[PDB]
Amino acid sequence: PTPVEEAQQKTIEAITKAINYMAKRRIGALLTIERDTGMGDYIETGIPLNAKVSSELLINIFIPNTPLHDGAVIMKNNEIAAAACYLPLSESPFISKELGTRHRAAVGISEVTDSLTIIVSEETGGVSVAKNGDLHRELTEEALKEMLEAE
Amino acid sequence: PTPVEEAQQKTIEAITKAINYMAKRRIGALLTIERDTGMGDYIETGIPLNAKVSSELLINIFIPNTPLHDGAVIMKNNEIAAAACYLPLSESPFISKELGTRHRAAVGISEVTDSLTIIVSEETGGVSVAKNGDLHRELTEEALKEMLEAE
Numbered sequence: 143p144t145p146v147e148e149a150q151q152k153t154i155e156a157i158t159k160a161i162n163y164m165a166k167r168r169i170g171a172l173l174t175i176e177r178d179t180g181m182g183d184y185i186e187t188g189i190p191l192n193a194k195v196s197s198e199l200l201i202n203i204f205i206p207n208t209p210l211h212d213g214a215v216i217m218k219n220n221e222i223a224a225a226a227c228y229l230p231l232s233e234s235p236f237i238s239k240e241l242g243t244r245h246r247a248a249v250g251i252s253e254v255t256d257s258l259t260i261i262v263s264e265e266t267g268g269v270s271v272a273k274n275g276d277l278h279r280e281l282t283e284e285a286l287k288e289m290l291e292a293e
Numbered sequence: 294p295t296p297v298e299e300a301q302q303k304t305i306e307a308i309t310k311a312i313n314y315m316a317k318r319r320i321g322a323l324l325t326i327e328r329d330t331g332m333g334d335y336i337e338t339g340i341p342l343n344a345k346v347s348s349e350l351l352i353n354i355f356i357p358n359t360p361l362h363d364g365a366v367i368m369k370n371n372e373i374a375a376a377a378c379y380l381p382l383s384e385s386p387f388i389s390k391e392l393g394t395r396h397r398a399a400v401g402i403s404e405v406t407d408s409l410t411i412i413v414s415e416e417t418g419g420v421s422v423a424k425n426g427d428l429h430r431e432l433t434e435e436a437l438k439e440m441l442e443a444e
């Protein structure tokens with residue numbers, strides 16, 4: 143594989159390790175991966191990081207009751223661009239009524255970009271993905287990894 | 294002030310704000326600022342970040358019981374180069390005997406580099422600085438700022 147392909151694989155491994163850790167501990171998380179539609183307007187609302195990705199940093203960001211935990215992390219390729227970012231809230235009626243603001247923000251950004259957003263529920267530990275206006279819930283670890291590899 | 298001067302002042306303010314937060318909560322912390330002596334060999338022992346400095350990120354790094362809290366943050370060229378880095382433990386017999394490995398690590402790196410290290414005690418929330426093999430204990434906010442500005 144090329145260096146670009148290896149870097150992508152390392153980033154997917156970092157993300158999946160972090161998401162799996164947070165799901166097990168019921169740490170709420172909201173992680174948007176920018177694709178071809180630029181997300182600068184939303185990146186600029188958060189705290190700039192421009193940091194190399196690691197599972198450790200992703201986990202540390204979302205620890206409850208910390209400066210960076212509220213709002214979205216936005217990733218650009220192999221970097222964490224910013225944390226605590228604003229995302230628009232979807233009004234879609236196909237968001238389960240029990241779900242809170244993290245899921246509505248994820249669907250919201252997915253309606254105006256081609257990004258892929260991962261959500262960990264602090265209530266259940268369930269993992270979901272928002273893409274193209276649709277929310278897919280209760281993902282297995284294998285399903286999440288496959289979705290990321292396909293992205 | 295010039296852009297470089299404004300950037301240095303912003304970094305000092307981010308550091309002091311994070312140190313004050315951690316001192317209040319008695320969160321142990323270890324933050325080494327590289328100077329003329331290169332510290333690449335120690336940076337390489339940690340988790341790479343190469344992140345923009347913010348008080349928020351510094352606080353999120355040092356939260357107890359998290360991946361990144363165990364070890365030193367090393368700053369270089371106005372960025373957080375890495376977290377959870379190893380520093381050498383001083384064998385000096387002239388460190389206050391009630392202090393533990395965090396402070397001995399800070400003195401240790403200060404014995405072999407011209408770096409400035411900030412330590413927050415998890416026992417007391419006291420703030421200290423290691424430079425040139427010596428530990429300056431129980432610093433006020435004004436004292437720490439003066440040291441950073443002098444450095």
Ligand SMILES: CCS(=O)(=O)CCN(C)C(=O)N(C)C
Nearest residue numbers: 159197198201358359360361
């Ligand atoms: C974190 C990513 S990891 O795969 O390195 C294991 C996570 N760690 C190290 C951790 O949770 N603590 C509390 C130290």
Ligand SMILES: [Mg+2]
Nearest residue numbers: 278279280281
């Ligand atoms: Mg299902």
